[PDB]
Structure formats: C-alpha cells, structure tokens
Scaffold this active site. Structure first.
Site, PDB file in Angstrom:
ATOM      1  CG  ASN A   1      12.050  19.735  18.965  1.00  0.00           C
ATOM      2  OD1 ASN A   1      12.357  19.780  17.974  1.00  0.00           O
ATOM      3  ND2 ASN A   1      12.371  20.765  19.818  1.00  0.00           N
ATOM      4  CG  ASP A   2       8.572  19.192  13.981  1.00  0.00           C
ATOM      5  OD1 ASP A   2       7.997  19.982  14.843  1.00  0.00           O
ATOM      6  OD2 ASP A   2       8.344  19.326  12.755  1.00  0.00           O
ATOM      7  CG  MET A   3       7.605  11.470  15.690  1.00  0.00           C
ATOM      8  SD  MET A   3       8.118   9.809  16.632  1.00  0.00           S
ATOM      9  CE  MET A   3       7.790  10.261  18.325  1.00  0.00           C
TER      10      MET A   3
END
Lengths: 69, 101, 337, 70, 338, 100
Positions: E208-210
């Site tokens: 969830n951190d792209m």
C-alpha cells in the site's frame, strides 16, 4: 510528414490530394482496377476497404506511406 | 586560367575552375542548400571532369543567341567557358555565373 | 475577327482593337495592356548573315527580353519577365504558328505559360508584323527567379538529340527520358498522363523538334522538382524538308536507341510510328491498358479543338492546311494495333 | 526512425518484427482487437487482402504510427 | 534448503553454503561471489533516532551503497552499483519480506533488477542478520550511468502521494498516472498490460506504499523513455497499523481525486476496491473487456506461484500468513465485476 | 542567493539560480541534447518558478538518508537547493549538481 490519426483521416487526405491533381474517379478505376463505388467508400472511410487498394491509390497519387514510433 | 564563381539564388554557392587536366566544379564547404542541378548533388562536394560538365555546357546558348554574341568579340567555339561568362547575368532560372576578379 | 491572344471571337466592344479584354488581362494581369509595341522590328532585332541550311528552325529565331513598365512593353538587356520571338527572316508566319500551337496546347489542358501575338510599330504604311510573346516560367509572384534546369544537363547528355556515340545514332529516347523524369519528379498518374499526352501531341501536330532542351525541371515546391510548362511548341508540318527529316526529335522507344531495333510500327505496312508504338510508351510509364485506351479515345474527341484552333488562327491558309493534313494522317494511325 | 513502406508485405513484416520484440502473441492481439488469429496470420505475411482498419488497429496496439509524405 | 537469492531448493553441496551457483551468478555475474559481507552492521549503519509515527516504513529504512570489487561487496560513499537495505531497527524481517515480494515479482514475469539476501559479519556468536541487496537499474552492461527520473518530478507533483491541496486529500491517482505514462512512453499493449498488472499486484500483495517516487522512467532508447523496473515492492500486510491506513498509496480512479467520489466498489456490500474498480482502470488504459477478462484468469492461475514463493521465503511464519491472508481475500474480490 | 551548474552525462547542460523572486533553471543556449526531465523540455530554455521546480525537489532525499545527512550538516529548514548541492555528485541517473 503527416501522422494518420484514423482510417477516415487517410481517406480524406488521399481525396484532397486526388482533387489537387485534377484526377477523377474514372481515371483511377481504369489505372488501379478498383471500382468507382469502392473508390468512393475508400475516400470517405477506408476502414472496410482492403489494404492493397488503399496502398495502390496512395501510390497512383504520389503519396508515400511511412511508419514510425 | 579561369576561376569563375557560381551563384544560385543571389548568393555564391561554389566555384567552377579550368586547368591543364580539365574542369572542376566544387560547392563551398559551408553551402548546405539546394543543388544547382540533379547532376551535381549537394552531398558530394568535388566534381572533376575532362570536358565541361553537361550542366554548364547546357547553359551555353543555342543557334541565334550564341551567334549574336560571337559576332561582338568573335569566339570560334574554342573556349566554351568564356562563352558561359558572356551570358552570366542572362541565364535561365536562378543561376548566375560571375568572374572572381 | 478573332483575338490576337486567345483566338476566340471578338465582341462588338473589342472588334476594332483586335484584342479582347479577357485576353489582355490573361497576358498582363490588367485590361489596360498596350499590345501595340512602341518600337519597330529593326530598332531592336538585327539581321545577321545566317549560319547554313541544315540547322533546326529554332536556330534562326531571334529572341528579345521584355518587361512590363506601366501597361507598356519595354525591351531590356537581360532578365526580363516576357520573351518576344519575332518570325525568322527566312520563316515568315512562324510567330503565328507558335501562337496557334501554344493556344491549342492551353485549350487541350496542358500547363502553358500565358502568351499572345503583339505588333511592332510600323516603319511606314506596310501591313503590321506580329511577334509571339510569352511570359517566362522561371518567375513567381512579382518576378522573383524560380530555379530550373534543362533535361540534357540533368541526364548528363552532351547533345540535345542524344547523338552521343561513335556513329550517327540517337542514344536517348522518349521512353528513357520519361523513366528518368518519373525518378526525379513526384511520380503520379496526373504527371504520367500529361507527359504521355505531350509526346503524342508533339507527334500529332508535327513538332518533330521536341528535344532534350525542350523539357525542363522547375524547383518550386521546395525539394521536389516538377516538369516545366509546355514551351517552344511549333508545328514543322508547313516546312516539307524539316518535316520529312524525322517523325519526332528523339526515338520513341528504348529498343530504338543506337538503331538496334525498329519500333513495331516501322515493321508494319505503315512504316512509321503507329498507335501500337505509343501504347508501348504508355505501358513503359506504368499506364494501364484500359486507361491508355480511354486516353486514345479522348485524343479522337479533341479533333474538334485541333481543327477549330488552327482554323481560327492568324497562320497562312497554306500553312494551316499542311498542319491539319499531318494531324489527320497521324490521328488515323492511332487506331493501329 | 522513419521507414517508407515499399509493399503491403513490407508493412506486414515490420509489424510482425515489432510484435515479436514486444513479446506479444497472436491470442493477446485477438482479444484486444477482435481480429481472428487466422486474419492476424494473413496480415503479418501480406496484408494486401486484409481490411485497412485491421492493419491500422494492429499498428496502433503495437505502438507504431502511420505517416504520409510525398 | 532454499537459496538466499532465488528461494529455489538447494542441492546436496550448496545446502551448507545457503546460496545456489545459479543465484550467485544471477546476482553478480560470477559463481565466485561472496554473499557473506566483510563488514558488520554497526560498522557502516548508524543508529538514527526515530522520527514520528506518521511516516511510512520506508522512512525508517537504512540504505547503503555497494560496489562489487572482485567477488567481494564493498561499501562506497557515492555512485555504487548495488544498494543494501538492512531491516529497520523497529521492523525486523523486513529485508526477508522485500526479498520474497521481489522474488515473486520476477517469477511472475515483471522486469525486476537482480536481488538477494546477504549476511553481515557477526559481532560475536549471535545469529546472522540479513539485508536485502539489489542491483541499480540506472547502470547499463558496464557501470556507466543510464539517465532516469521519478514520476513525481516528471508530472510536476510536489508530494509523492499527491497531497498537493489545502487538505489531506490526494490529487493524483493510478488512472491519471497511467494516462500520463501512456503519453510519454511508447503506447503498445505490452506496456499497458504490464503497468496494469503492477497496480493489481501492489493491491493483491499488500504493497500500500507504491507512490509516485516508486515509478520511474529510464532513458535507454535515447529520446523516448521506458518504464523503470519494479523496485521497493514490500508487503505491508504483516504490519496491521500500516496495512489499514490505505488499500493503495494513491487513489485507484481519477473520480476519487480530492475525495470527490468513491470508487464503485466502495458503494458495494464489500466497501473496498473490487474487480470492477480494476476493470474501470483497465478500460481507462484502452484495454479491451475480453483481454481484461483473460488477464484476470491469468492472475487466478498465478495463485500457486504466490503461495509457493512466500512459503519458500525467509520471512517469519506469522508474517507469511498475514501476507497470504491479505492475498486470498483480495484475489477473491477480483471476481466481483460485470 | 546562489547559482549552480546542472550536469547531464558529465557535461554542463545548464544553470539553476536562486534570488529574491524565486528560482530559475535555464539550459545553455548552445545545448541541443536530451532534456534532464520531461517537465523541463529542451525546446523551452527559461524555467522560472516561485518555489523549487518539482524535478529538483524530487532529486533531494526524504527519509533515512536525508536524516543522516541533516544531523551532521544542520542547514536552514527551507534550504531547498542548498541540500541538493551537498548530494550533487551522488544522484540517481546521469544528473550531477555542482557549485558555480
């Protein structure tokens, strides 16, 4: 060089070229073998016209087809 | 003996010279415009030949136009390069051949 | 009475002048043109003792440079916008022939520079003499020079008839010249049909001197050169010995270069160029048989424009008859093979 | 990187070389363009008889631009 | 039993070494590579004080520059060829997670730079600590620099999450980012299928951190750039606090920018992103419905590669089950579409 | 404020300056090579802005590496390009930011 946006764009450019050279549809039919009704369809939207007929018409009009990226 | 300057479209594009071996036309090393003839491409620079290049020989006038000029100073067709210089400011198109002086 | 520029019938308000408003405007850009030169023939054209009988008719023709200064034609020393071509001293009525032939070419649809017949100022009470005038094609909008070159220098041929060998044979044909043109200009069916018609019409009309210097390439649309307009189109039919010397200036087909082969028409009961030889020229240019057949039928239909233009002209009656006789004969030969 | 196309077959071959360098198979092209794998096969060999719109759709999916000149 | 580079089973002799010859060669170019670092963690990695809870796990991660002198890794001040990423002091086993996720991406067919796990020299007789190593993609065949740029600077976005307004809302979505990419790189369906799969796989795996700095453009062709390889792919599923903060780093659809609209999946009984939301992303990229349907079937069939890769990894057992639980749930949500 | 030389592929491509009004990046009038960013096209030469250009701000670090560098340097809070010169010979790609 003009990038062809759609088949319709090409038929319109080929038709503008045909008219600036003073070439009628009957002259093109005798030279290419493509009927005046197919030539009519071609100059409006060549989408359903065979590639070889579009390529033969571009040739008789002195138009070169190129590919890029 | 003659180092005639050739100018196309008002500006000098190169030199046409004559010597023992024959004739030589050469474009200026900084001329990247259109060729004066399809027989003298812009890509190639040097143009050596035993006889005067077909382009420069074609610029020399025909029958009446050359007899009217060869009556003023009397040129017995010996030197075709000197005849080109007599019609230098009267050529067809945008070509003009003028002396180096 | 017909117009000295257009050869069309003059209306009531143009009849006395001898020139139509349409014609004066076509030639000069203004209906205020004065086609009656303010100078005599001998004032600017000199009679030099001739070369010899054997040079083509164009070699005997004087040429004057003309400029249009306020509706009046003025003789310039160099680089004018028009060229005046008076009839040679030995060929009277040649200017009227070049005018009829060049008017016919315009009526037939060819690219022909604007032209007409202008009269010189008379010395005394002698009948007016006319000269052929034509606008230079190596000029654009406001007489700026447009570059051009003749086909002999472009193809690197040292003689305008292709007589470049160890014998007396011709080594460049219309077929080879057309093949060279197709590789240097934009290659299209309009260019090909036009160039083919120019070669057929030089033959039909008796222009047997359309050599390599009578073809040009004009550098107008940037990089791509174009075939120069029709120029120096004269019928040699009124001059029997010049007419008989050749059917065309160059051989028609490539097989005929160096006299290696005769054209099929030469092997037929006709013994000259026939329709079959011109079909072979068309075929070499990529023109299709069904198109060449149509192009021949159009030439047959243009019979009326040919007859009418020469009959409406200021050419002598004997000269018109000679041209139409050449024309009718050669037009009949087009049906063969 | 401008290439003048000489014949319809020249274009079919260039489009096929492009398809293979991108790792695209004929099935992926059929799903995306709607053109059958047999027509796609004919197209990549000689698109002379293939409709112009199909040749134009395949050139598009391959990231190839069609240009016109003189 | 498994290779510390490839995660494939180790044969008879390589068992004691822990690395396979195939893996050592893939990572270094030579089978003579020494994956046992000649330096200890504290020799080169300083202990910086914790900043604030607000920043993502990547903010707490140290990064070392490595050069390959012979078959030995050497720490450099600048311009290295590899990057060593040790596990943050607060996130133990994160290097093993990035290794599993990046190995999975390579097995799935993505362009992933060569990577593996290397051990630091121990201080005393304590258990070996591993760090994630990866080759820099901004290097060609030789160590010559290849130009590249991150997507935030290319799109002229001042924040990597698109929080560019007067509020905490996000103004750049994956749909907008894909539309920007399509206009700057060569179009083609191969590029589009890959980029679409990268976005679906970041969601399936719990990355969830792209964000915008996790996308790049490489200047290999010269004029026209290409999309940079997959990098910094980690599953946040083992960290509940970080996992529930967002489903993805950026909003999926353009309609969601500035919180103006919810994605259709948020309006369904599921209340999160579903297969229908990804079909809308595919559709915006020009992908055809019959092709998107096939692509979804391909992702279902890759279930075995996902399960196997994480189960073969050096991640903790609790961490693997958190990832596979996120994965199974989100994979089941892909069916919910027209 | 300050002026720096922007290098691409080891060659000075342009200059990035700072003053009262803000920042300005400009390519050398004789640089006809590739652009350093798709946000800074080579066709356009001048690039003025009130804040530091998104390309140059993206070049600066963010987490752990910016923190390790900040504890030993301690330069002005909003020293946007001052931090970029210190890490100029250590950037991603083929870009180098050197002092003028």
């Amino acid at each position: 060089l003009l990038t062809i946006e759609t088949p319709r764009h090409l038929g319109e450019q080929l038709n503008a070229r045909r008219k600036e050279l003073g070439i009628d549809l009957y002259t093109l039919e005798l030279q290419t073998g493509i009927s005046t009704s197919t030539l009519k369809r071609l100059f409006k939207d060549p989408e359903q016209v065979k590639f070889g007929s579009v390529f033969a018409v571009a040739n008789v009009l002195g138009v070169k087809l190129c590919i890029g990226e | 003996h003659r180092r005639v300057k050739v100018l196309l479209y008002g500006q000098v594009v190169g030199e046409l010279s004559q010597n023992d071996s024959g004739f030589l036309f050469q474009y200026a090393h900084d001329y990247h415009g259109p060729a004066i003839s399809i027989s003298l491409p812009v890509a190639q620079r040097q143009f050596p030949s035993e006889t005067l290049h077909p382009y420069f020989a074609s610029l020399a006038p025909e029958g009446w136009l050359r007899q009217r000029y060869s009556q003023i100073q009397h040129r017995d067709e010996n030197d075709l390069l000197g005849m080109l210089i007599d019609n230098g400011k009267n050529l067809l198109g945008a070509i003009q051949i003028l002396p180096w002086e | 009475a017909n117009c000295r520029i257009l050869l069309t019938p003059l209306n009531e308000r143009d009849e006395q002048r001898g020139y139509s408003t349409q014609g004066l405007k076509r030639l000069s850009g203004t209906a205020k043109l004065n086609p009656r030169l303010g100078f005599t023939r001998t004032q600017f054209v000199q009679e030099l003792p001739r070369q010899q009988k054997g040079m083509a008719i164009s070699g005997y023709q004087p040429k004057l440079q003309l400029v249009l200064d306020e509706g009046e034609f003025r003789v310039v020393d160099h680089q004018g916008n028009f060229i005046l071509k008076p009839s040679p001293a030995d060929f009277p009525g040649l200017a009227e022939n070049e005018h009829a032939t060049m008017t016919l070419m315009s009526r037939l649809g060819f690219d022909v520079p604007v032209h007409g017949l202008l009269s010189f100022a008379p010395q005394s009470e002698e009948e007016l003499e006319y000269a052929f005038v034509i606008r230079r094609y190596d000029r654009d909008n406001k007489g700026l020079p447009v570059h051009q070159e003749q086909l002999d220098g472009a193809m690197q041929i040292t003689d305008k008839y292709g007589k470049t060998g160890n014998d007396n044979e011709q080594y460049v044909s219309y077929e080879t010249l057309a093949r060279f043109l197709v590789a240097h200009v934009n290659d299209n069916i309009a260019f090909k049909i036009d160039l083919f018609r120019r070669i057929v019409y030089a033959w039909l009309l008796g222009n047997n001197d359309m050599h390599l210097r009578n073809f040009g390439l004009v550098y107008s649309d940037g990089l791509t050169p174009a075939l120069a307009p029709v120029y120096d189109f004269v019928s040699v039919a009124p001059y029997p010995e010049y007419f008989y010397s050749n059917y065309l200036a160059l051989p028609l087909l490539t097989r005929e270069e160096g006299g290696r082969e005769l054209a099929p028409g030469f092997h037929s009961d006709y013994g000259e160029y026939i329709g079959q030889d011109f079909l072979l020229l068309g075929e070499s240019m990529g023109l299709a048989p069904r198109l060449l057949e149509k192009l021949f039928q159009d030439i047959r239909k243009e019979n009326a424009i040919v007859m009418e233009t020469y009959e409406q002209s200021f050419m002598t009656q004997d000269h018109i008859q000679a041209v139409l006789q050449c024309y009718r004969h050669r037009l009949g030969l087009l049906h063969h093979h």
